[PDB]
Amino acid sequence: WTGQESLSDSDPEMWELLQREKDRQCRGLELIASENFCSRAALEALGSCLNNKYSEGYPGKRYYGGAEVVDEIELLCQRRALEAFDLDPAQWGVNVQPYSGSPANLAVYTALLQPHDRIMGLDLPDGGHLTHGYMSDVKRISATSIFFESMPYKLNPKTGLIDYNQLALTARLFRPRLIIAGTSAYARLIDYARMREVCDEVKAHLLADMAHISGLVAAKVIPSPFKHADIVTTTTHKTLRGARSGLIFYRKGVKADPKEIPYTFEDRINFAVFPSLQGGPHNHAIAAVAVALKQACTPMFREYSLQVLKNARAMADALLERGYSLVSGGTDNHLVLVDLRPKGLDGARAERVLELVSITANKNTCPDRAITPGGLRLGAPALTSRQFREDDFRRVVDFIDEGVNIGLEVKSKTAKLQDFKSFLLKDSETSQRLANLRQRVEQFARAFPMPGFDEH
Amino acid sequence: WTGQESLSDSDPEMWELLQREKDRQCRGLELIASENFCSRAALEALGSCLNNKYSEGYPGKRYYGGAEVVDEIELLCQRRALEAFDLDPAQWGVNVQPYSGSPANLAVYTALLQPHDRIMGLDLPDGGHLTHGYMSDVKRISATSIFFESMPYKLNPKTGLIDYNQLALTARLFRPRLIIAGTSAYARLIDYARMREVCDEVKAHLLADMAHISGLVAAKVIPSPFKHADIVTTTTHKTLRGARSGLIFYRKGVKVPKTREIPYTFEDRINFAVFPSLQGGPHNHAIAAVAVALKQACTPMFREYSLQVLKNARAMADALLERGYSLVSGGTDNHLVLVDLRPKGLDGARAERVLELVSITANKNTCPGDRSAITPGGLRLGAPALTSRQFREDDFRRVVDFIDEGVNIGLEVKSKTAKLQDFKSFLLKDSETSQRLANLRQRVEQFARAFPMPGFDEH
Numbered sequence: 072w073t074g075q076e077s078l079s080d081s082d083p084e085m086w087e088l089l090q091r092e093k094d095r096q097c098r099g100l101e102l103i104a105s106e107n108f109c110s111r112a113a114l115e116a117l118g119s120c121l122n123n124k125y126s127e128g129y130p131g132k133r134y135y136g137g138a139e140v141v142d143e144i145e146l147l148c149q150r151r152a153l154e155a156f157d158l159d160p161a162q163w164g165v166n167v168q169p170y171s172g173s174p175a176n177l178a179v180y181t182a183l184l185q186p187h188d189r190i191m192g193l194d195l196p197d198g199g200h201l202t203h204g205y206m207s208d209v210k211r212i213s214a215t216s217i218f219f220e221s222m223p224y225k226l227n228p229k230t231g232l233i234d235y236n237q238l239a240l241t242a243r244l245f246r247p248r249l250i251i252a253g254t255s256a257y258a259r260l261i262d263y264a265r266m267r268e269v270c271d272e273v274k275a276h277l278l279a280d281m282a283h284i285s286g287l288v289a290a291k292v293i294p295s296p297f298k299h300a301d302i303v304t305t306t307t308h309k310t311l312r313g314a315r316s317g318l319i320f321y322r323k324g325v326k327a328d329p330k331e332i333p334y335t336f337e338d339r340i341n342f343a344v345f346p347s348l349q350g351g352p353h354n355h356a357i358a359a360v361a362v363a364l365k366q367a368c369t370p371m372f373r374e375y376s377l378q379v380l381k382n383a384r385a386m387a388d389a390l391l392e393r394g395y396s397l398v399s400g401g402t403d404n405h406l407v408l409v410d411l412r413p414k415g416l417d418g419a420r421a422e423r424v425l426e427l428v429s430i431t432a433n434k435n436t437c438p439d440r441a442i443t444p445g446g447l448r449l450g451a452p453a454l455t456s457r458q459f460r461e462d463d464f465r466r467v468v469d470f471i472d473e474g475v476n477i478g479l480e481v482k483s484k485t486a487k488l489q490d491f492k493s494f495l496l497k498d499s500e501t502s503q504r505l506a507n508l509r510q511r512v513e514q515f516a517r518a519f520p521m522p523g524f525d526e527h
Numbered sequence: 528w529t530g531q532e533s534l535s536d537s538d539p540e541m542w543e544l545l546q547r548e549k550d551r552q553c554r555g556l557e558l559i560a561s562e563n564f565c566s567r568a569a570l571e572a573l574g575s576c577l578n579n580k581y582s583e584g585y586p587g588k589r590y591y592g593g594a595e596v597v598d599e600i601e602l603l604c605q606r607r608a609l610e611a612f613d614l615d616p617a618q619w620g621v622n623v624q625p626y627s628g629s630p631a632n633l634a635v636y637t638a639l640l641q642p643h644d645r646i647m648g649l650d651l652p653d654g655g656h657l658t659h660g661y662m663s664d665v666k667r668i669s670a671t672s673i674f675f676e677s678m679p680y681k682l683n684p685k686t687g688l689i690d691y692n693q694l695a696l697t698a699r700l701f702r703p704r705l706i707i708a709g710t711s712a713y714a715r716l717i718d719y720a721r722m723r724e725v726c727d728e729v730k731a732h733l734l735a736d737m738a739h740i741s742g743l744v745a746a747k748v749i750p751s752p753f754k755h756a757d758i759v760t761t762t763t764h765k766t767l768r769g770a771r772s773g774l775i776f777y778r779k780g781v782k783v784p785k786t787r788e789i790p791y792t793f794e795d796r797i798n799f800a801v802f803p804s805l806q807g808g809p810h811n812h813a814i815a816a817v818a819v820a821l822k823q824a825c826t827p828m829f830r831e832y833s834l835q836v837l838k839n840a841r842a843m844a845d846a847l848l849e850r851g852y853s854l855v856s857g858g859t860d861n862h863l864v865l866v867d868l869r870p871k872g873l874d875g876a877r878a879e880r881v882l883e884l885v886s887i888t889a890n891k892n893t894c895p896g897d898r899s900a901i902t903p904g905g906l907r908l909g910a911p912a913l914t915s916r917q918f919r920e921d922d923f924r925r926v927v928d929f930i931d932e933g934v935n936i937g938l939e940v941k942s943k944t945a946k947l948q949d950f951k952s953f954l955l956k957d958s959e960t961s962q963r964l965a966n967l968r969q970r971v972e973q974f975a976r977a978f979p980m981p982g983f984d985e986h
């Protein structure tokens with residue numbers, strides 16, 4: 072044994088699964104708003120020998136030896152992170168050790184708040200993420216709602232946009248210590264200036280979770296939350312097109328003067344990441360993130376982010392011009408909140424019909440009330456990374472419309488949901504129409520190239 | 528831009544750093560008991576297209592489309608995890624989504640306990656991990672001591688062993704809901720039966736954190752904690768020789784007395800704590816790499832590796848004893864050795880720095896009878912990393928020879944230096960000391976480069 076044998080030679084069962092998943096991504100229309108195809112450069116660093124190094128601590132303040140190289144890799148990733156978002160190192164610092172977005176947010180709350188302190192985030196059916204403090208009326212869901220006290224703010228159901236007024240009213244009553252200005256299913260731009268006004272009045276922290284729009288902010292394509300927020304959290308995949316990781320941007324320097332009150336975020340943020348919450352940093356992921364952060368400063372990323380908008384706007388217009396209404400009307404970022412209620416089909420079996428035909432999306436709750444949500448959430452960054460353009464996404468919408476029409480035609484002879492999915496696999500007529508649409512769907516997708524490796 | 532360009536061509540600055548770290552691992556004597564060299568087969572999965580797949584949920588209960596393949600990968604990883612540790616799927620389940628060991632242990636507490644519920648783990652300077660509830664006299668360190676209330680149990684300093692008697696006493700008074708049987712720096716086997724009796728008495732969950740010893744357990748070269756614990760966590764990048772990830776093993780089936788088969792209620796609570804409570808999207812590339820190394824653990828090659836890991840740690844221990852060094856608990860029964868350097872006049876902080884400068888990576892370790900904090904009197908030395916490089920018993924005796932020279936050099940510097948900052952500065956400025964280190968470093972690196980290295984060739 073050497074440990075240098077190939078995966079195909081040593082573990083062929085796993086290697087086959089790699090090729091199947093690689094073929095599924097190549098043959099399919101990936102429309103999940105949070106997915107993206109990582110570049111081979113970053114994947115080579117993700118599966119590197121950096122996995123072998125225990126480097127707990129921070130550059131200069133580490134606990135082991137032999138960390139001289141990972142210190143430079145972490146510092147480079149920190150430096151590349153600040154300039155992908157045009158930040159002054161004297162005003163902003165970044166932590167690159169969060170394992171993902173969920174751990175990154177939990178580190179922010181642990182750093183700045185005591186247990187049971189109050190947070191306010193956008194509710195989950197209203198577009199906010201789990202880690203913004205989601206608890207239903209029956210059960211505490213996210214640990215952000217267990218270890219901290221959470222009251223959600225909602226959208227205006229007539230407007231489809233964030234009810235900034237109701238937020239401000241409930242904010243002085245609830246008195247949160249931190250408000251999260253970040254979304255997972257929201258097509259408009261967040262008024263960070265209005266968020267900072269609410270935060271300055273109730274004397275809370277303004278955390279911006281830019282996970283979904285991190286690439287659009289890096290490319291100076293949409294307005295940046297760094298102008299108003301004290302702490303910014305992000306995933307490194309999604310629009311940043313990197314490995315699965317997380318980052319925590321914090322403000323450093325002087326804050327305010329009663330007679331130079333400094334910012335006290337850095338030491339708390341860093342201590343919450345390690346040793347409070349996480350153990351050993353994943354240096355292979357940190358390097359893959361630095362690779363993608365370098366690609367974010369390049370002019371091709373500005374052209375890439377600009378293309379994701381145009382194709383998200385094209386997908387929005389194409390869906391409107393086929394009858395589909397969209398929550399908030401259209402989009403301003405990378406995703407489209409489609410409303411399938413004015414069509415007679417939910418978001419549940421509509422996803423199952425599209426999934427059966429190599430089109431990946433997810434059900435999304437629209438401004439209704441169970442297992443059959445309102446519409447779906449369609450994303451552009453994934454396919455745009457295969458040089459999809461406006462005309463390409465118009466075929467995507469038409470391919471989706473055919474799936475919806477089959478979905479409306481299976482609710483024909485089915486009752487609930489199990490009746491639906493069983494018919495799509497049982498009756499020979501429905502399966503062939505789905506299979507026929509699959510060959511045409513997979514044929515259109517395979518033609519575009521795929522970032523990353525070739526067979527895995 | 529195609530996203531298919533090599534790292535060397537796309538990012539030469541990062542590619543140089545990847546190669547410098549690769550060279551540092553090839554040329555160094557890596558003795559960090561928690562480090563290992565991951566096989567290239569697992570690294571291929573770790574850096575694959577599985578990084579792109581958002582599949583939040585669990586196989587069969589996924590909230591995403593197109594998760595057909597990653598569900599098979601997770602299912603295979605689960606079956607390989609139970610097979611590697613000889614577990615009946617009717618009485619054991621495993622969650623393969625913890626990002627690391629710390630998120631694995633936090634998920635267990637969140638699943639089974641309420642905020643501020645009580646846990647007991649081995650204190651950190653005694654060999655327990657941070658995530659076992661570590662809290663100093665000044666500050667709550669680990670978040671497991673913030674969201675939950677922790678009281679540590681300690682070693683008997685005269686034996687270096689866990690004071691199971693004092694644990695049983697303090698647990699009757701503290702009344703923990705969960706006790707952690709697992710260590711970061713402990714050279715002996717843990718009495719899981721005694722831990723089970725203490726837990727059964729005070730009605731506490733027995734969590735076994737076998738992170739350091741997992742590879743030894745899977746190879747059945749040391750007693751398995753699964754015969755006694757309710758919950759078992761581990762990292763997958765130590766003696767298991769896989770990518771950095773975590774696992775949570777939990778019991779299933781019947782946990783009666785009057786009348787009434789009481790069931791185990793771990794599966795749903797554990798899975799819910801990982802997702803959606805704590806974590807988000809599972810890292811399928813990590814899950815796949817873990818599955819690859821898990822298949823490697825079932826092979827006769829891995830049992831020979833694990834047996835060699837035991838032989839080499841004992842060889843390192845015997846070689847250290849023969850040279851005048853004292854060991855916590857007088858030896859070892861697993862993969863590491865806790866060297867006490869106080870009876871030689873050099874603290875672990877000074878020895879760690881000198882060894883690091885001659886490409887011998889270890890970490891200082893607190894000895895059971897000390898409180899210098901800034902200058903721990905000991906060192907933790909591990910065998911799994913170099914054993915993967917096909918080191919043998921006499922190869923580790925040669926390692927101890929290089930260690931002995933570094934200690935002697937560090938001893939000479941201490942006599943000519945005052946504080947510790949003067950020590951670290953003397954090792955780089957003093958021409959004679961800088962030269963003596965350079966010769967030892969070169970002899971160490973030449974010896975280490977001759978051995979094979981798992982993984983890729985250049986990165």
Ligand SMILES: Nc1nc2ccn(CCCCc3ccc(C(=O)N[C@@H](CCC(=O)O)C(=O)O)c(F)c3)c2c(=O)[nH]1
Nearest residue numbers: 195197198199200201207209210212255256583590803
């Ligand atoms: N806008 C937004 N969009 C998306 C898309 C994916 N995600 C992230 C993945 C979300 C998956 C998820 C997990 C749990 C629940 C939940 O609420 N309850 C529990 C049990 C409740 C009970 O006991 O009744 C359950 O049913 O699983 C849930 F609604 C969703 C999000 C997100 O976070 N936000």
Ligand SMILES: Nc1nc2ccn(CCCCc3ccc(C(=O)N[C@@H](CCC(=O)O)C(=O)O)c(F)c3)c2c(=O)[nH]1
Nearest residue numbers: 127134346651653654655656657663666668711712900
């Ligand atoms: N046996 C064991 N061994 C190892 C080896 C690595 N690890 C995991 C990494 C351990 C990292 C660590 C440990 C302690 C403190 C701490 O006590 N800090 C206090 C006092 C600081 C001071 O001396 O001034 C403070 O911050 O105030 C800390 F901050 C960070 C462990 C482990 O867990 N156990």
Ligand SMILES: Cc1ncc(COP(=O)(O)O)c(CNCC(=O)O)c1O
Nearest residue numbers: 350351561627628629656710711738
């Ligand atoms: C028992 C135990 N639990 C958890 C962890 C940490 O898991 P992650 O680092 O993957 O989060 C360690 C490693 N502790 C560091 C060391 O021994 O060097 C450990 O020994």
Ligand SMILES: Cc1ncc(COP(=O)(O)O)c(CNCC(=O)O)c1O
Nearest residue numbers: 105171172173200254255282807808
């Ligand atoms: C805004 C936001 N913040 C944090 C996270 C957490 O990231 P991880 O799952 O990598 O921990 C997500 C994931 N959102 C999943 C989705 O939108 O489909 C997110 O959308």
